Design a protein around this ligand. Structure first.
Ligand SMILES: NC(=O)c1ccc[n+]([C@@H]2O[C@@H](COP(=O)([O-])OP(=O)(O)OC[C@H]3O[C@@H](n4cnc5c(N)ncnc54)[C@H](O)[C@@H]3O)[C@@H](O)[C@H]2O)c1
Length: 223
């Protein structure tokens, strides 16, 4: 079982007040990441190709560049697990965080593609999640979900040993074209979104409601 709390140790940078400085610094940062993170480098190079193919079929937000696009395609890829881990366990040893640039671009990508829109999404896991009664909840790491409860419950993501999250999010982003699917109706949720209403039902169902945007514990850490 894993704990569900306010994710006090997760690198949750929202980059308030440093977007301009980051867009200028992140490119160098990305090189540093690659030098210390072979897996990321591979994931990114492949993601880059894919993005070249996807980019022409549609128009993106002003400022939304190849870094944002490549970062997002990559997240829907296999690099997601390690990245999520590194973020979730940031405070546990911030010295070995080699996703400084990745984190920023992915965070920025979602912020740029975002609107006021809220969604009813579902998320399945094969690991039991226990809410430790903090009063509110944040995933900490970025977290994928699906508009379809069917997907979330498929043998792909869920099992009796796990948990089914029924989430009401307003910072989540529908990123169909970016995914490798595109049939899982993925909605990407930033780890810093806060759910003011938490409710466990049965042994493996958790409802998260009253989403709200709050300040993060970290801000412009690498700016
Ligand atoms: N999960 C879903 O319901 C769902 C739905 C649609 C698409 N996807 C897709 O999922 C991808 C994989 O994302 P994911 O859903 O597996 O997230 P993820 O891989 O983090 O989830 C798997 C698990 O990863 C590690 N983990 C996650 N949170 C943890 C925590 N708080 N503490 C300790 N370990 C933790 C644990 O093993 C956790 O059980 C891509 O394929 C994406 O398109 C997932």
């Amino acid at each position: 079982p894993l704990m569900l709390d306010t994710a006090p140790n997760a690198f949750d940078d929202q980059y308030e007040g440093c977007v301009n400085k980051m867009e200028e610094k992140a490119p160098l940062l990305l090189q540093e990441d690659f030098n210390m993170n072979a897996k990321l480098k591979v994931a990114w190079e492949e993601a880059k190709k894919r993005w070249n193919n996807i980019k022409p079929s549609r128009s993106y937000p002003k400022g939304f560049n190849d870094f944002h696009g490549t970062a997002l395609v990559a997240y829907t890829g296999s690099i997601a697990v390690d990245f999520n881990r590194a973020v979730r366990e940031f405070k546990e040893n911030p010295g070995q965080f080699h996703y400084k640039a990745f984190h920023y671009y992915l965070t920025r990508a979602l912020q740029l593609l975002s609107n006021g829109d809220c969604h009813s999404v579902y998320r399945g896991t094969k690991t039991r999640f226990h809410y430790t009664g903090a009063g509110s909840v944040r995933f900490g790491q970025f977290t994928s979900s699906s508009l379809s409860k069917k997907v979330a419950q498929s043998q792909e993501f869920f099992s009796d040993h796990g948990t089914l999250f029924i989430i009401k999010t307003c910072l989540g982003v529908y990123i169909k074209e970016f995914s490798f699917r595109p049939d899982q109706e993925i909605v990407l949720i930033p780890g810093y979104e806060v759910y003011q209403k938490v409710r466990t039902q049965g042994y493996n169902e958790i409802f998260l409601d009253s989403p709200k945007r709050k300040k993060s514990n970290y801000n412009c850490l690498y700016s």
